[PDB]
Amino acid sequence: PVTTATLGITQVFWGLDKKLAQRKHFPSINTSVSYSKYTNVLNKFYDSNYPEFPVLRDRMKEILSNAEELEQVVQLVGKSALSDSDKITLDVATLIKEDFLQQNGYSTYDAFCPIWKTFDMMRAFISYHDEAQKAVANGANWSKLADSTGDVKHAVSSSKFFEPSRGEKEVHGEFEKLLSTMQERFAESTD
Amino acid sequence: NGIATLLQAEKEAHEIVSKARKYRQDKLKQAKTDAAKEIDSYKIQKDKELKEF
């Protein structure tokens, strides 16, 4: 009753998941049920700073929802019937959950991931998904592309280790270099 | 033997080929950014008209 009477009044709902909490997947925000009614209000701020932030936010919510539904299907029907695009969605959302959504507090690097580093990491993840899907649409097989671009995937997953204390200019530069390396690696793999 | 020299020249030229493609691709990215800057001026002009309205 307290939770219902609180959801009826609060405009934000950061519902936590015990199952994600057990795996140390932290802060264990249940992205399926959590919502924020201030996303529409914050357009006037995201337009002034970080213009692509809402687009990336809806794109990542789309990726997470699609892969959650796909994993629900796979858990009972096996991964045999998945297409290459669906497999990419599964892998990209697993990467998102295990390296972007998860934020290891009480750690030097990821105690405070500020808005600019969050936006750059978000751009890196979304660009990785989009470029992988473009590469598979170009005819490259996903099984071979995974081995070809494991370096890019690990660089993306290791972007959370960029300490924010290095400064906004420094971390933004490192993320730009990482995006360039990612694009070059996919170009070489798909060539 | 001479086989290493034959392969090295091809490998060295192949690396330049990738660099040339990457540099040209980077210039394509820069060209799109420059083109968007011109489009941004039109948006700036439209914003001024909106402010005037």
Structure notes:
Chain A is mainly α and 191 residues long. Helices cover 62% and strands 2% of the residues of chain A. Chain A has one domain. Chain A has nine helices and two strands; from the N terminus they run H-E-H-E-H-H-H-H-H-H-H. In chain A, helix 4 (53-77) packs across helix 6, helix 6 packs parallel to helix 9 and helix 8 (150-157) runs antiparallel to helix 9 (168-190). The longest helix of chain B is centred in the middle third of the chain and has 51 residues, at 2-52. At the A-B interface, helix 9 of A face helix 1 of B.
Give keywords.
part of a larger assembly, 2 chains, A: 191 residues, mainly alpha, 9 helices, globular, B: 53 residues, hydrolase
N/C terminus separation of chain A: 59 Å
Query: In the residues of chain A, how many domains can be counted?
Result: 1
Approximately how much beta-strand content do the residues of chain B carry?
under 5%
In N-to-C order, the SSE pattern of chain B is: H
**How would you sum up the major sheet of chain A?**
2 strands, antiparallel
Report strand % of chain A.
under 5%
Please give the radius of gyration of chain B in angstroms.
23 Å
What general outline of chain A do the C-alpha atoms trace? Answer: globular
The structure class of chain B reads mainly alpha
Element-by-element helix/strand order of chain A: HEHEHHHHHHH
Greatest interface and its residue counts? A-B, 6 and 5 residues
Q: Which radius of gyration of chain A do the C-alpha atoms yield?
A: 18 Å
Choose one word for the global shape of chain B: rod-shaped
**Helical residue percent of chain A?**
55-70%
State the helix count of chain B: 1
Task: Give the gist of this structure.
The PDB classes it as hydrolase. The structure is cut from a larger assembly and holds chains A (191 residues) and B (53 residues). Chain A has 191 residues and is an all-alpha fold.
Topology, element by element:
This is part of a larger assembly, with chains A (191 residues) and B (53 residues).
Chain A lengths: L1 H6 L4 E2 L4 H5 L12 E2 L6 H4 L6 H25 L6 H18 L13 H23 L4 H7 L1 H8 L10 H23 L1
Antiparallel strand pairs in A: 1-2
Helix pairs in contact in A: 4-5, 4-6, 5-6, 6-9, 8-9
Chain B lengths: L1 H51 L1
PDB class: hydrolase
Keywords: V-ATPase, hydrolase
Entry title: Complete V1 Complex from Saccharomyces cerevisiae
